[PDB]
Swiss-Prot record, chain B:
GO MF annotation list: acetyltransferase activator activity; chromatin binding; histone binding; identical protein binding
Domains as described in the record: The C-terminal part interacts with the N-terminal part of histone H3 and promotes acetylation of histone H3 'Lys-9'.
Keyword Nucleus attributed: yes
Localisation: Nucleus
Misc. comment: Present with 3120 molecules/cell in log phase SD medium.
Protein name, per record: Vacuolar protein sorting-associated protein 75
Complete-protein stretch covered: 3 to 223 of 264
Keywords per UniProt: Nucleus, Phosphoprotein, Protein transport, Transport
Family per similarity comment: Belongs to the nucleosome assembly protein (NAP) family.
Species name: Saccharomyces cerevisiae (strain ATCC 204508 / S288c)
Gene Ontology BP annotations: double-strand break repair via nonhomologous end joining; nucleosome assembly; protein modification process; protein transport
Lineage: Eukaryota, Fungi, Dikarya, Ascomycota, Saccharomycotina
Record note on disruption phenotype: Decreases acetylation of histone H3 'Lys-9' and 'Lys-23'. Simultaneous disruption of GCN5 abolishes acetylation of histone H3 'Lys-9' and 'Lys-27'. Abnormal protein sorting to vacuole.
Curated annotation (Swiss-Prot), chain C:
Catalytic activity: L-lysyl-[histone] + acetyl-CoA = N(6)-acetyl-L-lysyl-[histone] + CoA + H(+); L-lysyl-[protein] + acetyl-CoA = N(6)-acetyl-L-lysyl-[protein] + CoA + H(+)
Primary gene name: RTT109
Knockout or disruption consequences: Abolishes acetylation of histone H3 'Lys-56'; simultaneous disruption of GCN5 also abolishes acetylation of histone H3 'Lys-9' and 'Lys-27'. Decreases acetylation of histone H3 'Lys-9' and 'Lys-23'. Decreases HTA1 RNA level; simultaneous disruption of HIR1 or RTT106 alleviates the effect. Increases sensitivity to methyl methane sulfonate, hydroxyurea, and camptothecin (genotoxic stress).
Name of the protein: Histone acetyltransferase RTT109
Induction profile: Expression peaks in cell cycle G1.
EC number(s) per entry: 2.3.1.48
Family as reported in the entry's similarity comment: Belongs to the RTT109 family.
Every Rtt109-type HAT domain range: 4-405
Self-association state and partner proteins as the record states: Forms a complex composed of two RTT109 subunits and one VPS75 homodimer; each RTT109 subunit interacts predominantly with VPS75 instead of interacting with the other RTT109 subunit. Interacts with VPS75; the interaction is direct. Interacts (via C-terminus) with ASF1; the interaction is direct. Interacts with histone H3/H4 heterodimers via histone H3.
Modified residues (N6-acetyllysine): K292
Mutagenesis / variant outcome for changing L150D: Decreases binding and activity stimulation by VPS75. Decreases acetylation of histone H3 'Lys-9' and 'Lys-27'
Residues holding acetyl-CoA: A90, D91, T92, R99, V100, S101, V102, R103, F194, A198, H213, I214, L215, W223
Amino acid sequence: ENEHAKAFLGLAKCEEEVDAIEREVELYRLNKMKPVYEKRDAYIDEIAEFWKIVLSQHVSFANYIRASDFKYIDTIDKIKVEWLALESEMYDTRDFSITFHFHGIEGDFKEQQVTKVFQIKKGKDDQEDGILTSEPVPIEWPQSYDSINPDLIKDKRSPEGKKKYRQGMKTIFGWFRWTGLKPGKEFPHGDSLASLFSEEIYPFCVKYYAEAQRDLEDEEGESGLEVDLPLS
Amino acid sequence: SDQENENEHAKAFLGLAKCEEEVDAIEREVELYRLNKMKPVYEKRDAYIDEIAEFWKIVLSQHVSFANYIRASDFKYIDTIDKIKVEWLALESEMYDTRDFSITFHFHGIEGDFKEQQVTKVFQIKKGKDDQEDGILTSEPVPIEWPQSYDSINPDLIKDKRSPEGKKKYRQGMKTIFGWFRWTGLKPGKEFPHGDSLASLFSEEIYPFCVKYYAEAQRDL
Amino acid sequence: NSMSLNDFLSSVLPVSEQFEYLSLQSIPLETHAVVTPNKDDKRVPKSTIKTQHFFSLFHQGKVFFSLEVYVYVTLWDEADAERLIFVSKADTNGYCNTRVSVRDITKIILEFILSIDPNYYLQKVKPAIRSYKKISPELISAASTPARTLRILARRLKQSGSTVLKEIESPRFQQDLYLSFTCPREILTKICLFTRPASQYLFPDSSKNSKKHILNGEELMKWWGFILDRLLIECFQNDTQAKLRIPGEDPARVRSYLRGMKYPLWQVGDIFTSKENSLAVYNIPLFPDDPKARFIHQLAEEDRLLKVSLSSFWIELQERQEFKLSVTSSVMGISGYSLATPSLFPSSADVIVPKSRKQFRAIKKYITGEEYDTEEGAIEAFTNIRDFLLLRMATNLQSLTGKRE
């Protein structure tokens, strides 16, 4: 019994070792990937439409935004992701700041550069993973969206107004105001969208870009990224 | 300046191709790094596991999909497993995939019928002909002493594989876990089914996370 | 005669009312057989072609109806050809402002599909596995790594100042990269429907809309039963198989339900029973998200495939967990030949065919990934589908006015 308890404890201590190791490993990866990212992004700049093509090739990204937003998503010419845990141990390895630059549309969208930061926060527990949070960042909404822009909506608690509000809140522009601190009143799943960029879109943009170059269009996505076997 | 322009594109495409390869190198380094740190912790961890009776049995029963892979008749024997040890080949040489590993089982002997023994099976990645291919796990058959009951269907034991009975019984044997031990991954559909998926089950889930499984089992209990 | 999808739909919609609709279709693909082949069989299909048809109807900027259908064409080297229409899902969300017959809408779309000539799906077919042997230069394919792909782009630029191959869709290449087939326009047609009640099928959380009307299993079966009966009378020849099975129900009741149908040949049973009386695996079709296939898979995972027989199979199936009675589940089948010959070839006006599965899935997702707890979801689906099409495809949803009085 006692020996068993000893082992069980030792087991629980081992799982705790593994977590530390994982964190260490992640930090190690982030430090190595850094200088390759600088090299890589410099090449990416030479390519036009790289970001537009990537954000069209990623499958779940579309899930978080309105189809109309793609008019604007297509103006993005640069994306930069800096992981904060490299500047200080205070930050979680999941923390990052993302900068987007949009070239703009004549008479509709203003050319601008926007930077958003995501950090993990905890609320009262030792044994809770934590959630992404952010601060609102100013972005200049396109003219086409005057009707759904939260800053131009007059009757906000109005019944119709409340619906115009919610529509604006489900655009990529709504996401910039996402914070993660007021559930149900903000861009839906703003944390998941944030994760996609750091976890997939920035890291694997090139795989995504190459996915768009298949000679036969029907093969896009075939790459990845129901019958039997009767007898032995 | 049509030349110059389509030429900057070609330069950047080559740059990116190089970075894609730099990143594949880094992933290996990171994965090694992780493997090196995990070794001592695993050793410490296994040494605690013996002290727990039937840890492995409980774990195997608890894992969701593991049971799909093998015959029910098989479980009696499975429950006799009292030790599992996975070693990652790539730790010993840059010539192995990080995925490559060797796995050892110790089986408590069952009397009269089932012998107690320790067996080690090795799996590694192989690619064929085309550079642009993923690669897959492969293995070498390794000797294992079959239980007597399975004797009627032990492949060595079956007189003629071809007879309709043989065709049916032999097939039966290959489908057993012991059948798995001779799995190689090079005679598709002539071997234990999904033998590679099982292997990966072991090096990616059942072993690295046996504890969580054990715990979940206790809670269920 | 109705010669367009528009012609069919309008006929059944309220007169003077405006409706828009989406008609999405996949590129026909070479695929494995619907029913698993028996090695000890006289014959085997040279090819099986699968196509998915997806429909959504919108009224006043809202989507309120959807229908998912699959169409298999099976080619036998010597044994003719059959086409099988699998009806997978149909749903409503209860957000329609005006009054309509969802039943006749569903029936009419199915007639349209019946009208299509089988050859249409066989003109250009995506190969299950392509071979690039007949082609050099090196192609960027699904298999290519990003690095290889990047390098290829660079070489191409250096050679010609372009990353593209002009001749890629050129006819000789097409002959090499695609398959084509022909077949009698008049062929054996089969329709299989499996009805299992649920709150939502294609409109998540629409169950939460009070306006929506949800059917219990019996109601549902009756609903699909009625549509099929008309299809039989309206578009099928006289001695045509019509089979209905309700698992776990006594046959007098089923036989008695059938007696009531307008078509006089409905029978209790399935359209898969054979003269040879083979095993279950060899007679049962494996469809997407289908009750029969999930269970054939289990029998596979237990090495029972050889063990089960058709009679046993139905019984064994009813036992399984998804089948918790009393809930009413039914399987319906039709086998036979069409009254009129199938001559129709769909047009852009008739359908939108995306360039890839990826693009097909993206559009569909706007409808099926939405939340219909509130009306806002119905509107959103309409909004995305429209904005996405115009934006990425320069396309509009079809527009029409109801003619029926």
